[PDB]
Amino acid sequence: MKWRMATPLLMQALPMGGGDTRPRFLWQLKFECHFFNGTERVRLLERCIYNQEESVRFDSDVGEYRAVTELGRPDAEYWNSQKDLLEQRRAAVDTYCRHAYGVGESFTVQRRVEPKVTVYPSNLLVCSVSGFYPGSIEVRWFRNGQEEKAGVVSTGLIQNGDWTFQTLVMLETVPRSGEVYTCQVEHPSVTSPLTVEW
Amino acid sequence: KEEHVIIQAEFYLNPDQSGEFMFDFDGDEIFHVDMAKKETVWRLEEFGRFASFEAQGALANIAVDKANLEIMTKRSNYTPITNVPPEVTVLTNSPVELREPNVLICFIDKFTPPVVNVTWLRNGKPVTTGVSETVFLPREDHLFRKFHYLPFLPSTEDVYDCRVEHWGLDEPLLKHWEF
């Protein structure tokens, strides 16, 4: 079960051997596991950031530490000299990234929540698509089997922050009697396109 | 072709002495570590059925982070962070319909350092009922994101305000929402 964590490295406390409006100093650390085509190719980036500006990075593609800014020179050289913590990070793509994938894959990669669709007038016809996951989605308007790519405006994808998404796609038209409108949504969470008619 | 990205994001901030530890999956928080209680807090409690995490590991990491921050601060000759003011948007979880339970979302974006005081006002009145918030979410440009939530009962009479304070702001930002 246990989720695994990567540990950052200490900087040398001896650069030269033995011998409220207050200003803020920020240090950020990021372990990025990038997965390509599932787990076929996995890339690990360790990023060290001082005051929003990255100073030194480890890239699995590079296989060693590289300074990003002048501030990062001592860290790259010091850490690269430790030639068996460098070996340790090279196989982190397996021990850390790929491991976390297998553990994670169940409720992240494979997480599927069906969108809720509601259509209502506002001179406007709004198709509301909410509560879905993942974010990749395509929403199209149907006028009784005919679609227009004119007067269509979408809010784009909105991330709610609770592992759900929403989006609103409106159609510019004053709905007359007789005509039939259809909003159709395609998503990985469903096996057949969702239709809601008006 | 890239498909998914898992990001372990930590930070430390002086002189505030604040720090966080979280995992990010495609922009969504997987979990964070409650430093004071030393417990793993999953974003969705269902996540804890499938996985576990030793919360202690986060505290040790953050201590290494402070350690390296002290060195970086002195090495940079005490160069302070440049403030970046937040972008604020107020939204609802679902389309609002009268007397049917909904949730107000206050989205704070594109800001640094990760320090923000957020207050919810309704009809001029400060509210604390049922409020919640996420940790400071990571960004590729190394800025921050944060979500604030307010469950509410949609009404024609009530009016809401989201007020956000940040050092990068000229004056606090109030963002409005009405039926």
Numbering used by the authors:
A (entry chain B): -30 to -12, 2 to 104, 113 to 188
B (entry chain A): 2 to 180
Original authors' sentences:
Professional antigen-presenting cells express a subset of different alleles of heterodimeric MHCII proteins on their surface.
We introduced an alanine in position β82 deleting the two H-bonds between βN82 and the peptide's P2 site, which have been shown to contribute remarkably to pMHCII stability. Indeed, DR1-βN82A/CW is a kinetically destabilized complex that displays a clear reduction in thermal stability of 19 °C, concomitant with a dramatic acceleration of the non-catalysed (DM-independent) peptide-exchange rate. In order to elucidate the basis of this phenotype, we solved the crystal structure of DR1-βN82A/CW. Surprisingly, the DR1-βN82A/CW structure was nearly indistinguishable from the high resolution DR1/CW structure, with an root-mean-square deviation (RMSD) value of only 0.432 Å. Moreover, nuclear Overhauser enhancement spectroscopy (NOESY) spectra of DR1-βN82A/CW in solution did not indicate structural alterations if compared with the much more stable DR1/CW complex, and chemical shift differences between 1H-15N-TROSY-HSQC spectra of both DR1-βN82A/CW and DR1/CW were restricted to the site of mutation. Thus, even in the context of an optimal P1 anchor residue, a mutation in the β1 domain α-helix leads to a kinetically instable complex (DR1-βN82A/CW) that tightly binds DM. This biochemical phenotype is not explained by the ground-state structure as detectable by crystallography and NMR.
